[PDB]
Amino acid sequence: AQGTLIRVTPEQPTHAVCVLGTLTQLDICSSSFSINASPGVVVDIAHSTWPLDPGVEVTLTMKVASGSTGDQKVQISYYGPKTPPVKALLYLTGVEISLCADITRTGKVKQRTWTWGPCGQGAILLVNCDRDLDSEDLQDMSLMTLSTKTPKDFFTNHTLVLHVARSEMDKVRVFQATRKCSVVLGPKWPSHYLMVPGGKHNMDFYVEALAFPDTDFPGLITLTISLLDTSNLELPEAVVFQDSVVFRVAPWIMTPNTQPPQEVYACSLKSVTTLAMKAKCKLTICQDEMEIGYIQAPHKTLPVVFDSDFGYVTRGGLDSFGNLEVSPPVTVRGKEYPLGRILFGDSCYPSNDSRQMHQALQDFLSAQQVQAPVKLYSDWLSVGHVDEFLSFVPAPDRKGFRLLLASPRSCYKLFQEQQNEGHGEALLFKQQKIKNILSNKTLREHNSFVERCIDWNRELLKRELGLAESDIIDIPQLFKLKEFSKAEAFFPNMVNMLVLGKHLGIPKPFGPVINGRCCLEEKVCSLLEPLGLQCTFINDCGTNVRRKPFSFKWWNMVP
Amino acid sequence: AQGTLIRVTPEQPTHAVCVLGTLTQLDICSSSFSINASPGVVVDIAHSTWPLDPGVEVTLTMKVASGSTGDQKVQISYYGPKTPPVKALLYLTGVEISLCADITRTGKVKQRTWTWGPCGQGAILLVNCDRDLDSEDLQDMSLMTLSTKTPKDFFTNHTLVLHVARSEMDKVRVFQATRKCSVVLGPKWPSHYLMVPGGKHNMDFYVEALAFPDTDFPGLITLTISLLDTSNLELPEAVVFQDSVVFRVAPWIMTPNTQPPQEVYACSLKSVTTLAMKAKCKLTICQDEMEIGYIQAPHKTLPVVFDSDFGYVTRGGLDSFGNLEVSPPVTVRGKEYPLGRILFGDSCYPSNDSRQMHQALQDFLSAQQVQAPVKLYSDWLSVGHVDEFLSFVPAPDRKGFRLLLASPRSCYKLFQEQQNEGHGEALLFKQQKIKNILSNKTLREHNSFVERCIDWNRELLKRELGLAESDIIDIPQLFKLKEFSKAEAFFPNMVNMLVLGKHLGIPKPFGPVINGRCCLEEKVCSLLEPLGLQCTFINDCGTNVRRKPFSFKWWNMVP
User: How far is it, in rounded angstroms, from Cα B122 to Cα B115?
Assistant: First the structure.
């Protein structure tokens, strides 16, 4: 490991503390020699040797915690070419000082750096999410334990201080478990003296994070323990040993439509509550301005809501959470994305009239980093949400899902196939005949332009999400360019659906009724049902969907 | 590579632009088939094949820039089970659009991500460092060239826009070289329309960075070119192709004493100008409140001064640049540190009375990242600069240098060896006899405490710098604890020396004169001279030392 420097001399004897586990270095030449020491002290040297050469390395390491000061000694025999051997003494005191936490992410407490992956190491911290002590309120916090084994009279000359760097103090809080609980490290103070008794003992600390990773907070918080020597009332305290643990603040994670729905929330019609039932998912009644996510820690995962037993956050129209989505887990050219990939849209390039999502929002999502955000193009739509052109649904064969992209083309073909069949007289919804829609050149170019915008996204999603055409399903859907040539749905946007597990709540396109059945509605089912989806059309919608968090622990990822 | 989506139909013919180098995707089924195309168009498909199956992949890629719109065509023959083959037409126009820069760091201009190392890729940018156009003032900037080959009448229906994300616009400036120069992208505007003529052409852009990497600026700046289609006066512009380059802003790099001195600067005695001579290094006459560093780019390296043809910076007593140093290049457990490792000191843990270097300073040095800063312990010294206990000097054998740590121990031994020899009557400098210094128990403990502080650093430097005892030289040096028990030099601090190449300008320790020669002065030479260092003692000191930048290009490192 690593350690301190002890200098011995024939002059007088030396005393010293040695912490179990640390590598203590010894300086012998600065006065042939010999090393003889107590049974409990393992002294190994490398070119045991006799040559009094400074290039020689001598290391001590206590075996067990001394029962009292100076239990173990080490004598250095100085001798050589016909001279009566002089002797150098050294009294050691072994203490056990270990600051422990849940570094194995196993939910159990048992150099110092945080590492990702299933083979990595590092305790995890949740952020305190409360809007407006004992076990009654500390189950959400992470446990840190200090264990010591020292000679009964040990803390008369040494004291332990717990600290955090000043740059991280406003991001963490530490409570001491007195076997009530009081703050010992926090935004107010970076260090704190511990009241620790000699002998065998161990106190409990409870830690919580006060901020999520962000532009200016990589996300790591380090807690260090220090062993101070204060045996000389005159001199100031001397650090004799330090050790620490490194916690990482749990990111805020979004949940994709492919995840089982756990609960739906509605504001202040009963088509949703009917669909919720078939879903096998709770329903409760009181806005699409927030997003239900989740933070996860070995010892607990807690649902957290994001807006502008629930936790909340408030960071910050493309600037809406309605313009925030997440891909299903996907692998891209070897790299793995277990928790999906955050999708949010904006414009192809910055203009005088370009809308975008507030940079604070963007910066924050990337800072969670575990769902590496992907920018899409939605600025062409009047409202601008990515939900207006895409959607994800569960699948039982391919990769376990299908990307649904709106398709004006799929609609022209359908309406056309209808005409050929003699139904050009069919009415949509001013009602318009399926014959006029087709003959309408202006509507055609408008949709031809939207096709361009969506295809651009098709390509983007195929690259960033490792998709293949076999993963995509185009849904018939038309558009119209209204204000500022921005796009709106010609008829209810079916790709803007409530994916409740495998039961879809698609908006009702009051389209051409052919044979007692709306041809669009009919076309949509012929595309999804062979996938297991049970389609149902509502007559549109303030509704959120708390979904089951991923089984894959985010910290096993490798960003 | 990557590309767009073309949909053909027996209905009518399609027109489309294809950029050379991009992979253009074609949709055939959405109307057995056959593909026949112009010589210049390479059409390869994979299960060329005849089966009209959507799972079939068809890709086009122009060979050369079309001389005029629609030079190359592609006809799709639709046929099968006894039906007269229908035909689908498609006219292509090939254009060459390449946005180039010095991605190979070779100083010559010839997906899109910046990568470190000798095998990496990515252009480099210098920050504008000026305090208070043409080639006369653009040699310091990086050249970016847009090259195009398009049909003469091409830019009547398409326009090119150059842009930067809004989040990076305040960090870059872009000038257009009109073959004067005017700003085209900057803190004021994120995008700009280019005036480009049809045919073969190429314009020059000059780029500069306006900020060094920092807590909130990873350091990358992306410049994107977009090819807009504006053939439909009604519809808005459609992005047809994008490409870009990614520049990385050059870090601020510190220069270690082991680097050849190029110039020394003195304020408003002539011992330095005498030493400067033997050095073979310029000397000029007008404060130790700034540090001369350097920024480096393939096309140029420019010396930059840091304070609180020279460039300057102003970010922000441990809070002094006097508490800022840098290790010589070193390798640590496999990891390479070619430009050294920034060393700055502070306290072992945060207290009510702990001093530290302003967090803005610390954050900034780490953000340069190429000299991964290492925190040392200096808070024990009254002044608190790491220069009071360490120093680096050039060496011809080991790793090319030696770490010099002050050593109270080395001084006690020397003075003691002196006494044994009968010189206990020797006077130091109230003058004090080398006999009293030794017998002084209080002075002894004081130094014993300082020994503790320095050894702590010895260990820190051995870990973080991969040092071995064979790399260190302890210099005899005593200390005394004055105000608040902080440490000061008992006699002139010899480890606080002006390392001018291999000619050291050590402070004069008016120590015990034994045999016409100060024993300390004598001891110091017996340690360094066998290394090639020519020691000379001055009678102390506002002096800085601009030293030669590293040959190793920082961007070949692998942080």
Answer: 6
